[PDB]
């Protein structure tokens, strides 16, 4: 408005921004709802109509993949809705208790998603997470310690097995998994690098999440030189379960 009026260009511009920014917050909070919806109503709630929220989730979004394939999010098949859990109390918001073995059930810190049972193909249509025996041209850079040979030990000090091979990510040169020959059953299981202290404290590599024998129960990969996304979640979830459910009597 005019030079003497109470309304002026600066505050009009500010209100234009406030409108734009409310719209943008709505749009962002709407984009946030592309996974995990509709909501699962808890105890004492009517389940006839869906719970979504005030920005309703948008229509499913369709991504195009390289080999002409197509993925529509939300990834509802990844949810694993029904698992081995029972409510610790009848009221809403009560936590759940694992009915069985949380390492095998995949519940709590040990939960995983029902990912596709196929490896990541990267760019040349080949698995990117492979054993070093299968990725020729790469090497452990002896500037750092070499994990292979070191026998891996549990959290309760029991040796679990021996490190046999280092699994690496191609095109992102990085060690992701250590292959472990289990103690005395002739079986190889993967161990995620972040779940291991590969420093040679004394002579070996130490994992404090699970104890020494539990290395027998780590979910094994079906192939030998490639690991699928499903097995990746299963392995990292088996190791994450120990953060709450193992505590290997180290008291």
């Amino acid at each position: 408005m005019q030079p003497g009026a109470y309304l002026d260009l600066a505050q009009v511009t500010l209100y234009v921004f406030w409108i734009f920014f409310a719209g943008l917050l709505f749009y962002l909070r709407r984009e946030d709802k592309r996974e995990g919806y509709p909501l699962v109503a808890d105890a004492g709630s009517g389940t006839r109509l869906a719970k979504i929220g005030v920005p309703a989730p948008p229509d499913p979004k369709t991504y195009l993949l390289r080999g002409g394939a197509t993925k529509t999010v939300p990834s509802t098949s990844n949810d694993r809705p029904n698992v081995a859990l029972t409510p610790a109390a009848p009221w809403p918001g009560a936590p759940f208790v694992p009915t069985g073995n949380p390492f095998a059930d995949g519940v709590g810190p040990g939960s995983y998603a029902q990912r596709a049972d196929v490896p990541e193909l990267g760019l040349d249509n080949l698995p990117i997470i492979v054993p070093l025996r299968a990725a020729k041209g790469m090497f452990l850079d002896p500037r750092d310690p070499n994990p292979v040979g070191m026998p891996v030990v549990g959290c309760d000090g029991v040796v679990g097995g021996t490190v046999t091979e280092v699994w690496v990510d191609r095109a992102e040169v990085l060690a992701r998994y250590l292959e472990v020959e289990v103690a005395k059953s002739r079986k190889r299981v993967l161990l995620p690098v972040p779940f291991a202290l590969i420093n040679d404290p004394f002579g070996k590599v130490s994992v404090d999440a699970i104890r020494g024998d539990q290395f027998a129960g780590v979910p094994t990969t079906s192939k030998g030189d490639q690991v699928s996304k499903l097995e990746e979640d299963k392995i990292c979830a088996y190791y994450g379960a120990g953060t709450l459910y193992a505590t290997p009597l180290r008291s």
Partner: protein
Amino acid sequence: SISGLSEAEAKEFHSIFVTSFFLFIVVAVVAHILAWMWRPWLPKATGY
């Protein structure tokens, strides 16, 4: 099928709810009468 309850549960809850709401409103009305006795509001356009 409805959003949670049955007409029996709804009517029972509504009976208790209306009773509690009425007594809450009655207490509020007594409070406002006492407040007005202490200090009336709504002055004339000139003041109190």
